[PDB]
Ligand binder design. Structure first.
Ligand SMILES: [Mg+2]
Ligand SMILES: [Mg+2]
Ligand SMILES: [Mg+2]
Ligand SMILES: [Mg+2]
Ligand SMILES: [Mg+2]
Ligand SMILES: [Mg+2]
Ligand SMILES: [Mg+2]
Ligand SMILES: [Mg+2]
Ligand SMILES: [Mg+2]
Ligand SMILES: [Mg+2]
Ligand SMILES: [Mg+2]
Ligand SMILES: [Mg+2]
Ligand SMILES: [Mg+2]
Ligand SMILES: [Mg+2]
Ligand SMILES: [Mg+2]
Ligand SMILES: [Mg+2]
Ligand SMILES: [Mg+2]
Ligand SMILES: [Mg+2]
Ligand SMILES: [Mg+2]
Ligand SMILES: [Mg+2]
Ligand SMILES: [Mg+2]
Ligand SMILES: [Mg+2]
Ligand SMILES: [Mg+2]
Ligand SMILES: [Mg+2]
Ligand SMILES: [Mg+2]
Ligand SMILES: [Mg+2]
Ligand SMILES: [Mg+2]
Ligand SMILES: [Mg+2]
Ligand SMILES: [Mg+2]
Ligand SMILES: [Mg+2]
Ligand SMILES: [Mg+2]
Ligand SMILES: [Zn+2]
Lengths: 54, 155, 232, 60
RNA sequence: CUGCCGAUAAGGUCUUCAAAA
RNA sequence: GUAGUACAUUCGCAAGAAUGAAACUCAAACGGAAUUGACGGGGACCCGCACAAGUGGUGGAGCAUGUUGCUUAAUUCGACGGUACACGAAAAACCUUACCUAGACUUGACAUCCUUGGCAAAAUUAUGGAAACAUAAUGGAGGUUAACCGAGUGACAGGUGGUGCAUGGUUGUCGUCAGCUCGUGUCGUGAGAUGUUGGGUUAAGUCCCGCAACGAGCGCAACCCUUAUCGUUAGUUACAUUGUCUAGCGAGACUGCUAAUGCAAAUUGGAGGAAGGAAGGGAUGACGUCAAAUCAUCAUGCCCCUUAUGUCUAGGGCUGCAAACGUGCUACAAUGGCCAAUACAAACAGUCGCCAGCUUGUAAAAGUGAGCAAAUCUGUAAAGUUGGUCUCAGUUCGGAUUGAGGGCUGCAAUUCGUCCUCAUGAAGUCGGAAUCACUAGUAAUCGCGAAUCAGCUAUGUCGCGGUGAAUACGUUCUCG
């Protein structure tokens, strides 16, 4: 996103910002309760976002 | 105020007649950044040269371009009123470059038809020292000869 | 000339974000963004006698977590946990009853070398008709005795009620602003004086961070203990 | 004339095309970022304090 | 290495202070 | 200052010489010396697309947009050399909107504080209505008042109203130029000087020497991001012509080695190396100047209005037009116009969306309708290659303007949306004096995507890739 620095005039002076959506994939073959029950105590730090697709 | 001499990019040996100079004139006739178009135009003119002059196109091109090459260069130097000119010996690299620039400039103004025949006619017309590029070279040479006196003072 | 915000130049490299949440949609990204500003402004504008240095906000799909660092948490706590209930109701009205709050006061260490409370103390002194030269010097000497690096204080405004605005700065030590590895904490405050507005800017140098990482580590809260509660 | 326009923007209009987007922090109408609901000069202040997670300065 | 090359309305801020810490 | 002036006197052929005031007027003087800056059509040295060498443009024509002036009920306000003029405005039909004409309101559309109850506001259907708003209806989530719905009620709310010459905050500019200062000490009666100036080296007040100076701070440089080679981890939604590709970590380049010369920093050459001497680009912009810009992002001292400069709505206006300028687009053409076939990208974006395919349509598009919450599905790449044709004409150039018929968005396209089809075919054949940008994937040029957005002659802005040059001898002139 590009935003003009100045309040009123001088459109030429415009700063920039970025926001990166880092992405990873991880596919589990077979889980079973032995893994699933242990999966309940993981506590994922807020920032990370999950897309569980079953 | 710069104290540094600029580098130089390679000239590249031509891909057909293996005569570097062909690539330079290709770049000179370049317009709109079309490498493809320029090669086609130029190459077509050598084929027309074959059909007309019955001689080797590279030899004709050298005989035209080498004949057009000037010797003296007049540099403008104003002091109080107008400019007294100064004849100086131009380097070899600039000699070929200036020759090519004039060849292209008078070629894109001839009364002829498609620039293939236009540019083809200028080079064949310059191999016999009778054309438009020749007159330009003649004029600067005569101007330098007239202004021989101030050649000693340059700056 | 104009300088880039010192805090804003070091965000995402050596400094973490004061609010860490991911919203659902572009409509829910605006509500969750203005609301946290109200909460932070609430803490800062009122409840000032506490020296609140920074308030962080942590939100999930529906659970709001607040981490509030202060130098004197007794005023927030109140008499046998009175003022505390009041602030909870304040926070609930701003975000909504439908969510879950987990406000957490956390007492702070080394309160001096923080540009927020210093600016607040500076602003209070100017509003209290205290002479400007004496006020900055006492704050400067106490901060240096606290055991930090150079501090830069710029106090621009209608100085001493004058009709022509001036500006007074006082650097004392190495304040490398162009350096990224340095830990510079910056804060700005508006001293509301009867003759107008006074802008105070405090640059503090708190050493060099030679451990690479987007922080995730405390900053001048570690030296003494840091606990207390009100959480769940 | 600012406060009345802010209140009117929150209120629903009688036509769908009558609805415009105004900054939620201040009341600026033009140059509003729908991705954040924040105008260009409030987004700078918020970005320089770390309130919006992930908006760091760019080097490209 | 001496071409040429003229003009620019009036009155105005700005240092408050070291008594001292 | 009057003024070496006037009167009187002496000398002189003459011009004049000698002598020599006052009235009036000012708070100082074309006073003296010295200091810090600025300036010089004064020198010495050094820098930058500055000049020079090239390339493509602008000023000429048509069109888009902004500005000056004029007009109007209003053509809202601000920006005005460089540092304003495709600027605020990253979307003016209604809304926006701050302007004008009208129709309506008064502790008010919004808020708190206080005595006091909650057994609502909405939305929508009727009638009158330009719509505001009124009279009637389902009397409404809920939670007993939480929030709000109110009554009573005066403090007051409200102002895009003035002052950016009262300010805070933010920004342009010199300028990414290499500067600006402080502590201690010394010299000088003093302003002040020293360090910071000398000699070498750089992009650099970068460093090394010298040195009544010794040190320090801000700036400079490096630490940050990105591109260029490789190693390691991982192998689906990439690859699957098997090791590309994507993104985590790490290695790599350190004047590290050598030759020359310098005390030393350091300069040049060579070696190896993907990369050599700031390897390319970005973020990063010192004290300060211009009382530079913004009270119309926001906040705020002070002044002004308070049944009106506040508020709601409908219509008009911000789109005018004898004119001038700025920034861009399209051209004046065979390095091209038109038609057919056809190869090769990167980045970004997408569930009121991207929209594949199919059917209809001369077309914009409509209907059906899967797929995709995304390395999976979608957003046709164009220049370029080949073939046919035009044969240099105001034309098969150029598209303006104008008439008609259609499509989309939206209550609504007349003021004032754009697209398609048909019809017409202005000027313009390289543009005067004078000017602008650029030192390689750069200029030039061809497409693609995103932001604000229901839609928008954005040809604007921010990005991505395809093709891809010419020139730099030098500081004599020119600007800083
Ligand atoms: Mg306002
Ligand atoms: Mg003259
Ligand atoms: Mg006398
Ligand atoms: Mg005199
Ligand atoms: Mg002087
Ligand atoms: Mg030139
Ligand atoms: Mg023009
Ligand atoms: Mg004209
Ligand atoms: Mg105007
Ligand atoms: Mg002004
Ligand atoms: Mg200006
Ligand atoms: Mg309007
Ligand atoms: Mg009820
Ligand atoms: Mg009750
Ligand atoms: Mg006001
Ligand atoms: Mg100003
Ligand atoms: Mg000395
Ligand atoms: Mg020295
Ligand atoms: Mg730097
Ligand atoms: Mg001014
Ligand atoms: Mg209207
Ligand atoms: Mg306009
Ligand atoms: Mg453009
Ligand atoms: Mg053809
Ligand atoms: Mg596939
Ligand atoms: Mg004509
Ligand atoms: Mg045409
Ligand atoms: Mg119309
Ligand atoms: Mg012609
Ligand atoms: Mg350059
Ligand atoms: Mg072009
Ligand atoms: Zn805003």
């Amino acid at each position: 996103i590009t935003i003009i620095r100045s309040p009123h005039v001088d459109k030429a002076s415009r700063e920039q910002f970025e926001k990166n959506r880092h992405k990873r994939l991880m596919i589990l073959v077979d889980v079973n309760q032995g893994a699933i029950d242990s999966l309940k105590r993981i506590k994922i730090p807020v920032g990370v976002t999950l897309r569980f697709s079953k | 105020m710069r104290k540094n001499r600029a580098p130089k990019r390679t000239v590249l040996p031509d891909p057909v007649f293996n005569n570097t100079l062909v690539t330079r004139i290709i770049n000179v006739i370049m317009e709109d950044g079309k490498k493809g178009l320029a090669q086609r135009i130029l190459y077509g003119a050598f084929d027309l040269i074959e059909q007309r002059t019955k001689e080797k196109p590279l030899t004709v091109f050298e005989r035209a371009v080498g004949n057009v090459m000037p010797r003296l260069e007049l540099r403008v130097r104003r002091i109080a009123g107008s400019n007294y000119q100064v004849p100086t010996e131009v380097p070899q690299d600039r000699k070929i470059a200036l020759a090519l620039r004039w060849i292209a400039m008078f070629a894109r103004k001839r009364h002829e038809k498609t620039m293939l025949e236009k540019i083809a006619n200028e080079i064949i017309d310059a191999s016999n020292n009778t054309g438009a590029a020749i007159k330009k070279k003649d004029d600067t040479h005569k101007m330098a000869e007239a202004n021989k006196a101030f050649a000693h003072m340059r700056w | 000339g104009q300088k880039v915000n010192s805090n804003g130049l070091r965000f995402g490299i050596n400094k973490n974000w004061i609010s860490r949440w991911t919203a659902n949609s572009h409509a829910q990204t605006a509500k969750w963004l203005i609301e946290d500003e109200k909460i932070r402004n609430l803490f800062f504008v009122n409840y000032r006698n506490a020296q609140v240095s920074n308030v962080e906000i942590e939100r999930t799909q529906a659970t709001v977590d607040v981490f509030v660092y202060a130098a004197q948490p007794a005023f927030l706590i109140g008499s046998e946990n009175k003022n505390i209930q009041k602030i909870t109701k304040q926070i609930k009205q701003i975000i909504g009853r439908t969510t879950n709050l987990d406000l957490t006061i956390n007492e702070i260490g080394s309160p001096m070398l923080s540009a927020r409370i210093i600016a607040r103390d500076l602003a209070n002194a100017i509003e209290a008709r205290v002479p400007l030269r004496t006020a900055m010097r006492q704050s400067l000497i106490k901060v240096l005795k606290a055991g930090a690096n150079g501090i830069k204080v710029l106090v621009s405004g209608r100085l001493n009620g004058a009709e022509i605005a001036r500006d007074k700065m006082y650097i004392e030590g190495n304040m490398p602003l162009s350096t990224l590895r340095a830990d510079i904490d910056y804060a700005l405050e508006k001293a509301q004086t009867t003759y107008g507005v006074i802008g105070v800017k405090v640059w503090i140098n708190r050493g060099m961070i030679y451990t690479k990482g987007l922080n995730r580590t405390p900053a001048h809260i570690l030296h003494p203990q840091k606990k207390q509660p009100n959480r769940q | 004339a600012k406060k009345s326009l802010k209140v009117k923007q929150t209120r629903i209009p009688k036509f769908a095309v009558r609805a415009y987007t105004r900054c939620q922090r201040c009341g600026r109408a033009r140059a509003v970022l729908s991705h954040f609901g924040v105008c260009r000069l409030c987004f700078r202040e918020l970005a320089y304090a770390g309130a919006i997670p992930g908006v760091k300065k760019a080097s490209w």
